[PDB]
Each structure stands twice: as structure tokens, then as C-alpha cells.
mmCIF file of C-alpha atoms and ligand atoms in Angstrom:
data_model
loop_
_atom_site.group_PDB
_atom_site.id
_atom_site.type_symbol
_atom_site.label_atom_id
_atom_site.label_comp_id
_atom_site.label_asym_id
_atom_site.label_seq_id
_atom_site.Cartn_x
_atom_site.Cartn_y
_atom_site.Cartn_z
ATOM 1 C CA UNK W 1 94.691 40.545 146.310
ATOM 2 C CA UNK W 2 91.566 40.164 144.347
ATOM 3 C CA UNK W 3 94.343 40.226 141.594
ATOM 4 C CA UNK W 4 96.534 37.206 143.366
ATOM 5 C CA UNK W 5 92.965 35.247 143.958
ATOM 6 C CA UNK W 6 92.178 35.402 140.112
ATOM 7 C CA UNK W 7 96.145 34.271 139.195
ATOM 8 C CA UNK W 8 96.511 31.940 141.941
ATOM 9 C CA UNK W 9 93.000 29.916 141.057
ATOM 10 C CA UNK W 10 90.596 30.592 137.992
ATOM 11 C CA UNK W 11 93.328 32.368 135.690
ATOM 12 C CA UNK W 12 97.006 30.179 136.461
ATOM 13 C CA UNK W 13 98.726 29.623 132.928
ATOM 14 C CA UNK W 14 97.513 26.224 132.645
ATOM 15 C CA UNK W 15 93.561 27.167 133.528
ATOM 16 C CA UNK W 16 93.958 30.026 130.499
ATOM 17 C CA UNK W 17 95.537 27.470 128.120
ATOM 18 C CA UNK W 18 92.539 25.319 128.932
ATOM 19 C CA UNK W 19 90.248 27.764 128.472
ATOM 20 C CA UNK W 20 91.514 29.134 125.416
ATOM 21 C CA UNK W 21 91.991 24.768 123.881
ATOM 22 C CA UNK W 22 88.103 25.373 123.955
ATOM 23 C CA UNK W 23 86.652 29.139 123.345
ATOM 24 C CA UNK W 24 89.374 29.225 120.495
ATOM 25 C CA UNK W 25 93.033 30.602 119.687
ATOM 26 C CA UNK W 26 93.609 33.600 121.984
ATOM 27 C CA UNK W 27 90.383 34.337 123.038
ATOM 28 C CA UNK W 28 89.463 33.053 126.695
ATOM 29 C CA UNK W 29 85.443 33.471 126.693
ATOM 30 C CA UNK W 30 82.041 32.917 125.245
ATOM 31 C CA UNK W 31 82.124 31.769 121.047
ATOM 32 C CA UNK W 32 85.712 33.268 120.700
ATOM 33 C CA UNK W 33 85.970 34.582 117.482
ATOM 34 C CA UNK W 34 82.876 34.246 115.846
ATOM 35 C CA UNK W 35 80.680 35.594 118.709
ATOM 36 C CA UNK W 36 83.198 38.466 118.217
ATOM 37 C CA UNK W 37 82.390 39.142 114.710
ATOM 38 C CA UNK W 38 78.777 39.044 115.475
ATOM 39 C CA UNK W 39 78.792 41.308 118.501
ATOM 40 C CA UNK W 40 80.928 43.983 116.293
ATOM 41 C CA UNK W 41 78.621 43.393 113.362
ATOM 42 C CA UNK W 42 76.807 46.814 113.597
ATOM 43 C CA UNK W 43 79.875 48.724 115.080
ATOM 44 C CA UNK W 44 81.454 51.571 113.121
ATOM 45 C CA UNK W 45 85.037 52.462 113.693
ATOM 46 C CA UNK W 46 88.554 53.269 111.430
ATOM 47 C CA UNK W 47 92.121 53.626 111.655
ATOM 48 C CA UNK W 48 91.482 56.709 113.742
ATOM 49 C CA UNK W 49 89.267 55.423 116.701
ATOM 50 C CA UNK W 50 90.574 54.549 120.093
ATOM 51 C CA UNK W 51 89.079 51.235 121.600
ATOM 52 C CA UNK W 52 89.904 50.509 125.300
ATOM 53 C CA UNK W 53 88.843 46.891 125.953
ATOM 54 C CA UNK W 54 88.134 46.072 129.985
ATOM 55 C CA UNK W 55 89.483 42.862 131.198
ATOM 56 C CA UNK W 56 91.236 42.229 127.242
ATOM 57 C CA UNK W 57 91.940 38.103 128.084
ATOM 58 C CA UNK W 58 94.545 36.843 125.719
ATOM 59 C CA UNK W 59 94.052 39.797 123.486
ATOM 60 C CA UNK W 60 92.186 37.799 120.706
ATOM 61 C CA UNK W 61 89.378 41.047 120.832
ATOM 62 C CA UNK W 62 92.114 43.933 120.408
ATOM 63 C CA UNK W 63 93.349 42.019 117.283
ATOM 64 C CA UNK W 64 90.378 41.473 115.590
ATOM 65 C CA UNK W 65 88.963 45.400 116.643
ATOM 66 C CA UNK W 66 92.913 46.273 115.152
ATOM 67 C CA UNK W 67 92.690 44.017 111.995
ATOM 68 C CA UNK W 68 88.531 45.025 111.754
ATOM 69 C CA UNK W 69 88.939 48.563 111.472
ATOM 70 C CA UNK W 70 92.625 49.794 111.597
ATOM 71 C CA UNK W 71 91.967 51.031 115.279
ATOM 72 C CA UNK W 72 94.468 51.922 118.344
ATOM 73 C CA UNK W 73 93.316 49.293 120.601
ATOM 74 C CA UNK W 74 94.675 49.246 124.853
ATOM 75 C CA UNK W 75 93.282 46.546 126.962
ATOM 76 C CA UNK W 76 93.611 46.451 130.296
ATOM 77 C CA UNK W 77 93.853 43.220 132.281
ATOM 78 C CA UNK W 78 94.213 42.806 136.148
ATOM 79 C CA UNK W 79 96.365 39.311 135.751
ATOM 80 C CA UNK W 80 100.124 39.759 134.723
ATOM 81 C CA UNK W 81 100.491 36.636 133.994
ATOM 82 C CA UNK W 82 97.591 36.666 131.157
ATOM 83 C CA UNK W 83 99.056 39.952 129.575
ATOM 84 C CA UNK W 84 102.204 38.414 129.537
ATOM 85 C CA UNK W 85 100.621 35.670 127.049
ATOM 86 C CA UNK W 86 99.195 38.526 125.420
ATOM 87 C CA UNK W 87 102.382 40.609 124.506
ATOM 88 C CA UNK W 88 103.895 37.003 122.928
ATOM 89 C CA UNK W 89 100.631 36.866 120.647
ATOM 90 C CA UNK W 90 101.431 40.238 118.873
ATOM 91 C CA UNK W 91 104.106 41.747 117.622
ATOM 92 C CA UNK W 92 105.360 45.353 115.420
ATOM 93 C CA UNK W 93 102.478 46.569 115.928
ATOM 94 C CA UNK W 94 102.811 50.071 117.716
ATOM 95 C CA UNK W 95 98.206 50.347 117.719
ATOM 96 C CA UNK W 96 97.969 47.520 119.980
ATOM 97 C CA UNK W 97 98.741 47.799 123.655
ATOM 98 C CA UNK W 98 98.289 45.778 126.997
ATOM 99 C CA UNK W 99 98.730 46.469 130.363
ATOM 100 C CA UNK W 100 98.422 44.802 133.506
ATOM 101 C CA UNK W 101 96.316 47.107 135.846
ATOM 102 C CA UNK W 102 93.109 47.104 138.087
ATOM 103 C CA UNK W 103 90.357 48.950 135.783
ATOM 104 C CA UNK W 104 89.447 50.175 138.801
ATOM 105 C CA UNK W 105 92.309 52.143 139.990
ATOM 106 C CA UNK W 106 93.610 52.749 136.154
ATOM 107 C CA UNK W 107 93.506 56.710 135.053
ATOM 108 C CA UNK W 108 92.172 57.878 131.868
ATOM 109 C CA UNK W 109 91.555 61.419 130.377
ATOM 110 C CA UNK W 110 87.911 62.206 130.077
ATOM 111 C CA UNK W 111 86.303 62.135 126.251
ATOM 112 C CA UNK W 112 88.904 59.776 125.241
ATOM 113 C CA UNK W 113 87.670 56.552 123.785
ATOM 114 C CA UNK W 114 85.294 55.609 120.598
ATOM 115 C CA UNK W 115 84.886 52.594 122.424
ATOM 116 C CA UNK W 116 84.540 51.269 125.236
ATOM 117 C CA UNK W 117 84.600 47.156 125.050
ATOM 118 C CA UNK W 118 84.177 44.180 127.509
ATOM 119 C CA UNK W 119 83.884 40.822 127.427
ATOM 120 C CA UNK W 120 82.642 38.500 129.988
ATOM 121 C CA UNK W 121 84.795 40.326 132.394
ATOM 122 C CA UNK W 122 82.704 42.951 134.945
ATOM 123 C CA UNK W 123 81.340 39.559 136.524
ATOM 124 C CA UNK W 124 84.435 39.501 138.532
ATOM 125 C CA UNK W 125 83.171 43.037 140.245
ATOM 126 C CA UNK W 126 81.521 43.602 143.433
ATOM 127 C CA UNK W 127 77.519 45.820 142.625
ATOM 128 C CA UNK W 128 79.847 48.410 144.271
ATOM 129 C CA UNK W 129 82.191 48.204 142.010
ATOM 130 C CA UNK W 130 79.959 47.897 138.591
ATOM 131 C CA UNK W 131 78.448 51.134 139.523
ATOM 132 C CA UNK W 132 81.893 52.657 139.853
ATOM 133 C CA UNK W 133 83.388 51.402 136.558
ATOM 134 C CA UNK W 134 80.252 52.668 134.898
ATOM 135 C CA UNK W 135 80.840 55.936 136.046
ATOM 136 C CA UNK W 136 84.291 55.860 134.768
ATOM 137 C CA UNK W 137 83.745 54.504 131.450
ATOM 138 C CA UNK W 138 81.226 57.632 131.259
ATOM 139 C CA UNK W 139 83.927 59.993 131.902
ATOM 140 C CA UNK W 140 86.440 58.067 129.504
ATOM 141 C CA UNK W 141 83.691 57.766 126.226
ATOM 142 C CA UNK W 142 84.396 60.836 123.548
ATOM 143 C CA UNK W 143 80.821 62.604 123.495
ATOM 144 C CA UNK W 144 79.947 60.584 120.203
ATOM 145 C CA UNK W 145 81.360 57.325 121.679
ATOM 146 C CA UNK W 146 79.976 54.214 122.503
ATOM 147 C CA UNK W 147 79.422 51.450 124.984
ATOM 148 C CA UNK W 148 79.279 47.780 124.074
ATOM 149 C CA UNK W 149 79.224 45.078 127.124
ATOM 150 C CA UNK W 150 78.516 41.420 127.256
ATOM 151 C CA UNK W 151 78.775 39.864 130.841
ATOM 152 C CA UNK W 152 77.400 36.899 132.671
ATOM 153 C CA UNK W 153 73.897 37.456 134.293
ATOM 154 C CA UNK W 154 71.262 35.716 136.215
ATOM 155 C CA UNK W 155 68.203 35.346 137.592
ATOM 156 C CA UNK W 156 67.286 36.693 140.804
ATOM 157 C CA UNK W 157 69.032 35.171 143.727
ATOM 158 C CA UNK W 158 66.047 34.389 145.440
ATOM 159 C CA UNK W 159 65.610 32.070 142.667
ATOM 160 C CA UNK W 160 68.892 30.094 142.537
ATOM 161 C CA UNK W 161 69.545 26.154 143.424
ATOM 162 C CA UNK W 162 72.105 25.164 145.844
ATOM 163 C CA UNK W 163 74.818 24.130 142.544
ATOM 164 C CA UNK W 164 74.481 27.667 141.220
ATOM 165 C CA UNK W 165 75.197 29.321 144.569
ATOM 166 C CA UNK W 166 78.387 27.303 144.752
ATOM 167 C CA UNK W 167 79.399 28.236 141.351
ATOM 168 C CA UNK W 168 79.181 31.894 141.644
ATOM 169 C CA UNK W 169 80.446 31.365 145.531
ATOM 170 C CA UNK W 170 83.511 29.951 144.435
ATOM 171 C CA UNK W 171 84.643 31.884 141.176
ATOM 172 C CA UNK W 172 83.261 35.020 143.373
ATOM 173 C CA UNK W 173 81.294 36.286 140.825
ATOM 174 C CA UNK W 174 78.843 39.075 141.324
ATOM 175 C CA UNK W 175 76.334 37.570 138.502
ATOM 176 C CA UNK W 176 72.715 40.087 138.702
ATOM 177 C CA UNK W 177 69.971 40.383 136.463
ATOM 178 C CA UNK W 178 70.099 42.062 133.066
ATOM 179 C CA UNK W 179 67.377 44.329 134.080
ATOM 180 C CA UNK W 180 69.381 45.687 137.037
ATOM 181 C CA UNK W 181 72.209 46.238 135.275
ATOM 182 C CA UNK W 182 70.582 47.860 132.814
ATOM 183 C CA UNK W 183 69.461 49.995 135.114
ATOM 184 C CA UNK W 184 73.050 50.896 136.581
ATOM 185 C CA UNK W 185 73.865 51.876 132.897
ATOM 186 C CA UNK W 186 70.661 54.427 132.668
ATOM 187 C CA UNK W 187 71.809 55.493 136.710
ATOM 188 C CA UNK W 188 75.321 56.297 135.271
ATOM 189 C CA UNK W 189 73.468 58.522 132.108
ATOM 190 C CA UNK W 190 74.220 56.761 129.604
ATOM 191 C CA UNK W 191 71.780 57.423 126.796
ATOM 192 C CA UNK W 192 70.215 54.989 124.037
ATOM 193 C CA UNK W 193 70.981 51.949 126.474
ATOM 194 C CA UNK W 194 69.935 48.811 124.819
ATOM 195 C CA UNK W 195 70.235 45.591 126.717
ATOM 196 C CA UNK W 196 69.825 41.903 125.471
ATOM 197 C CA UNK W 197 68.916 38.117 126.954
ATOM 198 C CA UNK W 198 71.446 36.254 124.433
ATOM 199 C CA UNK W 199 71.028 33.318 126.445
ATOM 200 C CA UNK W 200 69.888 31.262 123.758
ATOM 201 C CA UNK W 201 72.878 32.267 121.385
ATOM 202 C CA UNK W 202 74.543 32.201 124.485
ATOM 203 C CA UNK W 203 73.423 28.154 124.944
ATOM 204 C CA UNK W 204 73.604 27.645 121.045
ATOM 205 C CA UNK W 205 77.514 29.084 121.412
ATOM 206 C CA UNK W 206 77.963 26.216 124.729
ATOM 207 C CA UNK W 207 76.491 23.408 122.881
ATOM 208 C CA UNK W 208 79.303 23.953 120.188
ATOM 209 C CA UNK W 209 82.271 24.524 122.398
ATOM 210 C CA UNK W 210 80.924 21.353 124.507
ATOM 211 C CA UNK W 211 80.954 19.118 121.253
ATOM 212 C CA UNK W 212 84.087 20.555 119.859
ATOM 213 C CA UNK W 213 85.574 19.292 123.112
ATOM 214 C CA UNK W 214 84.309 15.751 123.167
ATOM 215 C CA UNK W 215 85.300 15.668 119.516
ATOM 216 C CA UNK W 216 89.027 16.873 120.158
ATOM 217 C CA UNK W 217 89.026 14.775 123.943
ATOM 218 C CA UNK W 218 92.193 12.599 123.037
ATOM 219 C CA UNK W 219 94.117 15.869 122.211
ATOM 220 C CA UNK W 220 93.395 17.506 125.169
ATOM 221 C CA UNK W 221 94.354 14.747 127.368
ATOM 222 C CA UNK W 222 97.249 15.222 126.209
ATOM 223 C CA UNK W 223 97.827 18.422 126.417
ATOM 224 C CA UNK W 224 96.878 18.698 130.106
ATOM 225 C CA UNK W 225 94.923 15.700 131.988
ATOM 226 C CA UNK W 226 91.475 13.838 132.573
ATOM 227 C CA UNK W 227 91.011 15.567 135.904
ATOM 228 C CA UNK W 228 90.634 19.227 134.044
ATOM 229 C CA UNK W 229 88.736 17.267 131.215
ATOM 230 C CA UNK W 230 85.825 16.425 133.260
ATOM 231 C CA UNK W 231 85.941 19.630 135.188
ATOM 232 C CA UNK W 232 86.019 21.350 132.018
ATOM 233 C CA UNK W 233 82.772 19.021 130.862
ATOM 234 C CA UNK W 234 80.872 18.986 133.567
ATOM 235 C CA UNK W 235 81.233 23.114 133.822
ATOM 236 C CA UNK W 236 79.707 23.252 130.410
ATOM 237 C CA UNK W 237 77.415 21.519 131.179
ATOM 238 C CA UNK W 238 75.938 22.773 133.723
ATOM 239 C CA UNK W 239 76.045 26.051 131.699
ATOM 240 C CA UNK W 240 74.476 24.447 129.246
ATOM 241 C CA UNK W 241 71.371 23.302 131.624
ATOM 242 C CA UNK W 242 71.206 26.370 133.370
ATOM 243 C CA UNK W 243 70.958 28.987 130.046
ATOM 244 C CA UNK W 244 68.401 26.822 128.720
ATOM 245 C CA UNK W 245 66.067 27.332 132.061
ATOM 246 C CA UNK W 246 67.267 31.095 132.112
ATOM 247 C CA UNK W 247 69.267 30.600 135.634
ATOM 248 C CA UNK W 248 72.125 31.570 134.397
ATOM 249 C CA UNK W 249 71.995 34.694 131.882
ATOM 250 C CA UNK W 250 74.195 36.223 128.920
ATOM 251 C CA UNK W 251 73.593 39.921 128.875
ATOM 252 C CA UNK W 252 74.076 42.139 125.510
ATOM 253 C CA UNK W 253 74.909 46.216 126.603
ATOM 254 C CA UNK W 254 75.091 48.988 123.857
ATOM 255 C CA UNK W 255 74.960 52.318 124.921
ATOM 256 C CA UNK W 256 75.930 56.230 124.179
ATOM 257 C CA UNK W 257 77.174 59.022 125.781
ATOM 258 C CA UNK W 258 75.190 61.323 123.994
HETATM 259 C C1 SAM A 301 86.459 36.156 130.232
HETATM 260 S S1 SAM A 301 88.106 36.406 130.941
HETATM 261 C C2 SAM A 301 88.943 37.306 129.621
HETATM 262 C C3 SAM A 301 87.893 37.746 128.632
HETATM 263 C C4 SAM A 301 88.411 38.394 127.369
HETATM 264 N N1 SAM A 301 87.681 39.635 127.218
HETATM 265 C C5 SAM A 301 88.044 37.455 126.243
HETATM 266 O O1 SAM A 301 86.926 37.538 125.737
HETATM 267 O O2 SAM A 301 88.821 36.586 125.841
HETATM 268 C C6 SAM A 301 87.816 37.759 132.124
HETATM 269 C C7 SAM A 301 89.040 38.667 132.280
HETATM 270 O O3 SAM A 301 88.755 39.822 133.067
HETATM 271 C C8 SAM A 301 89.894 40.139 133.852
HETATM 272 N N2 SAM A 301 89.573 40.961 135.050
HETATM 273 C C9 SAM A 301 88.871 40.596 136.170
HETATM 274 N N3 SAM A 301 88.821 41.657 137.011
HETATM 275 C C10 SAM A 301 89.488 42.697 136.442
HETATM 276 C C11 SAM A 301 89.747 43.996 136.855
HETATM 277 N N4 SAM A 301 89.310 44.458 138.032
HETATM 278 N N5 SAM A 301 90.471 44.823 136.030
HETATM 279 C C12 SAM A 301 90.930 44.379 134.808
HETATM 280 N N6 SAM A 301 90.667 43.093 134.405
HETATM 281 C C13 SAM A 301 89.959 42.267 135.211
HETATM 282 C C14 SAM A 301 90.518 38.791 134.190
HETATM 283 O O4 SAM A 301 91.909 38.885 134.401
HETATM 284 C C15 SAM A 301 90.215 37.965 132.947
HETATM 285 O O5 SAM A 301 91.330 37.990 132.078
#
């Protein structure tokens, strides 16, 4: 359902090849492997830890977390299709896992992850539905685990144009402020909850994807055709316009349980 509208539109195997041909080999959003190493920078794990990464793409984030730090790494994606590309990425290694599943409906024991990881993936919930994967991941964090989020955002809606609407109308996206989701975070009990506007690492991390694809344009013709090039382009760049005016919104989460 929500699962055939993401395979049958934004996430079919071509739009994921596409999409990774610019974020970077097996990684499917925002500065693919070197936003990675900067948003784990400061995070302390080891061969012990369990990681559960929400919504885990390609799989390019449970590698690095496994390579990083030696840790058992699950990610949970709602498209079969896109795990499928995952399982082909890795191979004999028994700490590395992905399944195909709704987060929402997936069952975990309480206390039992380090970490709990997204990327640019809880935009695809309903508000209803943020607030109830919250309270999950709550349950699911060990009492000394952590939190660590980074998800589209906006402004208000009261303060959107008539493009932006359309975007987030036709991807439905639920995209809210960092402040209010923040405040689901605090709601849910988390503890130490930082929360960052990276839109401006955010724009620096568009302005090199965008350049790396008019660079490599003859390439990626073909590989898939001039239609998806300019759609591709033209969706950059709008992202690019829109982070620089603070429209649209890349949000930093790190939280604790305790
Ligand atoms: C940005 S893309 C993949 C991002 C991946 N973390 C990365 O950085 O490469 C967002 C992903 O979230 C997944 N997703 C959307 N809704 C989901 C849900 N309810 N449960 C699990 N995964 C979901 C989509 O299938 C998609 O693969």
C-alpha cells in the first residue's frame, strides 16, 4: 500500500540506481558517504553494539557502522525491491542483516539497541506516525543507548510557495519543522535531545552532488536517459534554492534514553 506507492513511483529499480549514480555507491540520500562519516564522527560503538538502522536504503550506512566499529548492524526497509539490491551488495558477513518490513508494524524486544539510526527516511511518515515510531524506538534503545536522526524538514506550512506544496504533495512527504519535531522527541522522553538546522551543510552537500552530475552528464545519459537527467537537475535545484532561503530544512537529532 503505502509500501506498493513507494516501489511503484519514487523507489522502482531504475529511480534507486539514479539516485544512488548521484548521492554515491550504495547509499541513496543526502552526501552519501562522507556526510556519513561526519554524522558518526562523535559516535562511540564496538564489535559488541547492536545498531538498527530505520529505512537502511541500499545498505551503504550498515556497512560503514559494520566496517566503523565491528557492530551487528539490521536495517529495516519497507521496499523489497531495495533490500533485494541490498543483500547483492554484501556478502559472508553473518553482523549485517536486512529485511523488508514496515518499521511500523516490525517487533523488537525492549532495551535492545545501542543505536538507533535513520537517514532521510521518517519523512515518508504521517505526524501520526512519527509520534508512534518515536515511542517505539524508546522502548527498543538499551538504557545507555542512543538516538541519532537526520530527516528532511521545513518551514511552517503557512509559509510555503505553490512549487514546494507540489513537491511534498506528490512524494507524500510529511516534511515539519525541526522545532516540532524536536519536540515529539522530548514528548516521547527522550533525554539530552539535541536538534540541528544543517541546512547549510545540507546546501553545501547539494551544490556538490549537483556539479558532480553536470560533470559526469554524458555518462549518465547513458546509463538511463535525458528525461530523468533534467528531472534529476531541476530537483536539485530547487533543493538547492529552497535550503538556501530555509524553506526546505535538514534536521540533525541526537538523543538518550537515559
Ligand atoms: C533516503 S531513502 C533511503 C535512505 C538510506 N537511509 C540512505 O541514506 O541511503 C528513504 C528510505 O526509507 C524507506 N522507508 C519509507 N517508509 C518506510 C517505513 N515505513 N518502514 C521502513 N522503511 C521505510 C524507503 O524504502 C527508502 O528506502
Amino acid at each position: 500500500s503505502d509500501k506498493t506507492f513507494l516501489e511503484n513511483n519514487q523507489y522502482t529499480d531504475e529511480g534507486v540506481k539514479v539516485y544512488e549514480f548521484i548521492f554515491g555507491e550504495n547509499y541513496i540520500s543526502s552526501g552519501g558517504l562522507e556526510a556519513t562519516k561526519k554524522i558518526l564522527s562523535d559516535i562511540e560503538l564496538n564489535e559488541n553494539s547492536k545498531v538498527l538502522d530505520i529505512g537502511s536504503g541500499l545498505g551503504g550506512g550498515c556497512m560503514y557502522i559494520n566496517e566503523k566499529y565491528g557492530a551487528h548492524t539490521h536495517g529495516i526497509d519497507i521496499c523489497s525491491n531495495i533490500v533485494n539490491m541490498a543483500n547483492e551488495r554484501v556478502s559472508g558477513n553473518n553482523k549485517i542483516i536486512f529485511e523488508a518490513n514496515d518499521i511500523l508494524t516490525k517487533e523488537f524486544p525492549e532495551n535492545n539497541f545501542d543505536l538507533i539510526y535513520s537517514r532521510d527516511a521518517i519523512l515518508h511518515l504521517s505526524l501520526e506516525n512519527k509520534n508512534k515510531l518515536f515511542q517505539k524506538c524508546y522502548k527498543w534503545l538499551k538504557p545507555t543507548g542512543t538516538l541519532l536522526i537526520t530527516d528532511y524538514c521545513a518551514t511552517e506550512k503557512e509559509n510555503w510557495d505553490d512549487e514546494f506544496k507540489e513537491y511534498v504533495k506528490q512524494r507524500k512527504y510529511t516534511l515539519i519543522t525541526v522545532e516540532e519535531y524536536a519536540d515529539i522527541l522530548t514528548a516521547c522522553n527522550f533525554k539530552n535531545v539535541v536538534s540541528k538546522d544543517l541546512s547549510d551543510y545540507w546546501n553545501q552537500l547539494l551544490e556538490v552532488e549537483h556539479k558532480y552530475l553536470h560533470e559526469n552528464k554524458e555518462e549518465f545519459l547513458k546509463l538511463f536517459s535525458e528525461k530523468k537527467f533534467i528531472s534529476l537537475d531541476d530537483g536539485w535545484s530547487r533543493k538547492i534554492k529552497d535550503s538556501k532561503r530555509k524553506m526546505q530544512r535538514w534536521g540533525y537529532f541526537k538523543a538518550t534514553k537515559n
